[PDB]
Design an enzyme around this catalytic site. Structure first.
Site, mmCIF file in Angstrom:
data_model
loop_
_atom_site.group_PDB
_atom_site.id
_atom_site.type_symbol
_atom_site.label_atom_id
_atom_site.label_comp_id
_atom_site.label_asym_id
_atom_site.label_seq_id
_atom_site.Cartn_x
_atom_site.Cartn_y
_atom_site.Cartn_z
ATOM 1 C CG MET A 60 -1.927 -1.143 1.228
ATOM 2 S SD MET A 60 -3.023 -1.079 2.655
ATOM 3 C CE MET A 60 -1.841 -1.223 3.990
ATOM 4 C CD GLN A 115 8.472 -3.452 1.566
ATOM 5 O OE1 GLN A 115 9.329 -4.009 2.255
ATOM 6 N NE2 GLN A 115 8.402 -3.607 0.249
ATOM 7 C CB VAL A 116 2.539 0.159 4.843
ATOM 8 C CG1 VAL A 116 1.303 -0.211 5.648
ATOM 9 C CG2 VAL A 116 3.332 1.256 5.537
ATOM 10 N N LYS A 126 3.425 -3.109 8.867
ATOM 11 C CA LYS A 126 4.665 -2.435 8.506
ATOM 12 C C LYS A 126 5.836 -3.362 8.799
ATOM 13 C CG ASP A 159 4.877 16.584 9.057
ATOM 14 O OD1 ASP A 159 4.424 17.505 8.344
ATOM 15 O OD2 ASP A 159 5.476 15.593 8.588
#
Length: 269
Positions: A25, A26-27, A42, A136
């Site tokens: 979708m 590192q996931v 993940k 953020d």
């Protein structure tokens, strides 16, 4: 803490082999074969970048500490192997940025109202019970699913949208910029070719407030105006923001975010 999946009250002893990788979708999007639940996983590789792995572990630390916050993506469990760490997170629909892209237009105020109360309470939770400043806030970190839930993303949850004093309550400014972008479908600094040009317009130009010809309620325009205060000393904190008429309205009003989300996702790409 590890080797167990907790999917809605029930706990299941499992390993990484008990999950079917359904793609990236590192996931990863993976399916629990024991129950059929589809979760987000993940994968933090041991040989990976030390800078990236540090941010993943720090963000996971806050997520594990934020189990009592309903407006933050939760951890379903961890799997530690000799070469990898697999982090099971709850599968969310998509971020608010992709919702804006799929909508190809403004997002309704009633959706942004429920979104506002969810993100403010999440930011207020991070600062009071953990002393965490997100630093953020942006539409890419606002996650919505098919059940109408609105939660803060775990990426960078441990600390273009930068406040004037940052170039404490700087996340309030970023929230206001995100609300203007989602309410109009236009980023208020889209014609800036560089990051430094954005910072100049934040300091030199007046704050970009909501337009008055789109039917926005007076509470919405007031909440955004308060979020976009140039002087940070006069910008309200989360305690004052939670007392705003815009927050109080959508804390109780029944907004069918789920049906709206399904209709936007049903729109073709």
């Amino acid at each position: 803490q590890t080797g167990y999946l907790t999917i809605g009250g029930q706990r299941y002893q499992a390993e990484i082999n008990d999950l079917e990788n359904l793609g990236e979708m590192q996931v990863w999007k993976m399916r629990f074969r024991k129950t059929g639940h589809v979760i987000a996983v993940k994968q933090m590789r041991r040989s990976g970048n030390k800078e990236e792995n540090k941010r993943i572990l720090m963000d996971l630390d806050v997520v594990l500490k934020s189990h009592d916050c309903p407006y933050i993506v939760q951890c379903f469990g961890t799997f530690i192997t000799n070469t990898d760490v697999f982090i099971a997170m709850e599968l969310m629909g998509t971020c608010a940025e992709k919702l804006k892209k799929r909508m190809q237009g403004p997002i309704p105020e009633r959706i942004l109202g429920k979104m506002t109360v969810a993100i403010v309470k999440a930011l207020y939770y991070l600062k009071e019970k953990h002393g965490v400043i997100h630093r953020d806030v942006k539409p890419s970190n606002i996650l919505l699913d098919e059940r109408g839930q609105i939660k803060l993303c775990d990426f960078g949850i441990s600390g273009a949208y930068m406040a004037p004093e940052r170039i404490i309550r700087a996340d309030v400014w970023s929230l206001g910029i995100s609300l203007v972008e989602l309410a109009t479908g236009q980023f208020p600094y889209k014609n800036c070719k560089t990051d430094f040009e954005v910072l100049t317009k934040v300091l030199q130009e007046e704050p970009p407030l909501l337009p008055g010809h789109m039917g926005f309620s007076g509470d919405f325009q007031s909440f955004v105006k308060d979020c976009l205060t140039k002087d940070h000393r006069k910008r309200p904190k989360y305690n004052k923001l939670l007392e705003h008429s815009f927050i109080k309205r959508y804390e109780t009003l029944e907004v069918d975010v789920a049906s709206w989300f399904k209709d936007v996702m049903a729109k073709t790409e």
